Structure 1
């Protein structure tokens, strides 16, 4: 099933803040599912090597939340450059889905896409221009059928890996309870 036109690239980034103009990427994880949301593969996980003054002067939210998740320390200890993570990610994703076919999948994935466009345009090129944004459906559920949100489970932050598994599980809940089979 490695090359199916309908497979999906799921990803989550962690950043030093919200604005691509000043902020940089700290973490990347990728999961490939088939079109039915079965998990076909996990990409490597990269904490991105960043200097201490970058890590120390990020967003208050980020100091707290990345400090808590253990990401900050993992970037202190990493030798991984963004340049390397971009090559590996692109090669992995190429191994699984044809160029141009899969939209970018995840929660508020357009935010991530801003960072990928600016900092990893080679990687972005493998994707379709479309976004599969799980938060779109959450917003429709909030207004159309909010009790569905009760079945949605949100665990605590560790890896970007975990945040992706949450997005998939969330969409899986919607498929079962919110969309018509």
Structure 2
């Protein structure tokens, strides 16, 4: 394939037990590679990470109500997948598709996700350039500079990690068309 292109992009999204990685942990991870024009080249290996029920039945109330209602809390018990499992097979996918230190990490408020990857999945982190490509930076500029662009952005729920990433890419495509001057 024309994979390994220097300008290819790694997008990802995590679900977690909450906002503070000091104590909280990673529940689900997904990965999409695009070319630089945002064409999805590959959906990588999705993972629920297995944790116990003392972990799962002691989140914040935002997390019990929404990981329950999406069937993720239940998928975590089902899984017998480790973090070092997810890590090795995430970094694997990503070595095929793009080089090393080339792509930033891409998604909405991707810095928050990066806090968890840094602590818990360092080997995966080291493949990335140190920069983020945070689509919410663009959303914050559009709010102030051209707010009506946001009518064309699509918000369809929350869902799995996978469809969240696709919402992020799609959000950026809208910007590419209506907000950037290429």
TM-score, normalised with respect to structure 2: 0.98
Q: CA shift at 1:159, angstroms?
A: 1.2
Q: CA shift at 1:68, angstroms?
A: 1.2
**Cα deviation digits, residues 69-102 of structure 1 (max 9, x gap):** 1111110111111110000000000010001000
Distance 1:134 1:151 in 2: 15
The count of aligned residue pairs is 181
**Residue of structure 2 in register with 1:52 after alignment:** 53
Q: Which runs of 5+ in 1 are unaligned?
A: none
Distance 1:146 1:157 in 2: 22
Which 4+ runs in 1 deviate beyond 2 A? Answer: none
**Cα deviation digits, residues 24-62 of structure 1 (max 9, x gap):** 000100000000000000001100001011011011101
**Cα deviation digits, residues 102-152 of structure 1 (max 9, x gap):** 000000000000000000000000000000000000000000000000000
Q: Which shows bigger deviation, 136-145 or 63-72? A: 63-72
8 Å Cα contact 1:70/1:158 also seen in 2: no
Q: CA shift at 1:157, angstroms?
A: 2.3
**Residue of structure 1 in register with 2:69 after alignment:** 68
8 Å Cα contact 1:66/1:72 also seen in 2: yes
**Cα deviation digits, residues 147-170 of structure 1 (max 9, x gap):** 000000011222100000000000
Q: Which shows bigger deviation, 59-68 or 113-122? A: 59-68
8 Å Cα contact 1:24/1:115 also seen in 2: yes
Where in structure 2 are the equivalents of 1:27-176 lying within 5 Å?
27-176=28-177
**SS of match in other structure, 1:157:** coil
RMSD, aligned α-carbons: 0.6
Q: CA shift at 1:171, angstroms?
A: 0.1
Distance 2:179 2:66 in 1: 31
Q: Which shows bigger deviation, 107-116 or 59-68? A: 59-68
